[PDB]
Amino acid sequence: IAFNHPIQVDQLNSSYFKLSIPTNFSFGVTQEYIQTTIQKVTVDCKQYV
């Protein structure tokens, strides 16, 4: 196994602060499903049984 460490941005002790910012847009991603409804089933009694 190996888990990569996230971007490390050190913390200055002066009055300045160090920041890290993006360079590109790279839009888009695959997404989840909510399963709002379920199938409706009716059983005919005296026919199956």
């Binding site: 009716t42 005919d44 009694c45 005296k46 026919q47």
Partner: protein, 49 residues
């Protein structure tokens, strides 16, 4: 009139006399009455055997 073993929905009045009945095996409607055991069933679409 001949007699045979059936299931009926009987309505007993306060004085214990039967003034209304339904036989379950006649008119899908009457099957629907014998289920719910009532002389009034709400409007809807009901699956029937």
């Amino acid at each position: 009139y001949k007699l045979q073993p059936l299931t009926f929905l009987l309505d007993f009045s306060v004085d214990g006399y039967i003034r209304r009945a339904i036989d379950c095996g006649f008119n899908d409607l009457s099957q629907l009455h014998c289920s719910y055991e009532s002389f009034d069933v709400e409007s809807g679409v009901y699956s029937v055997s």
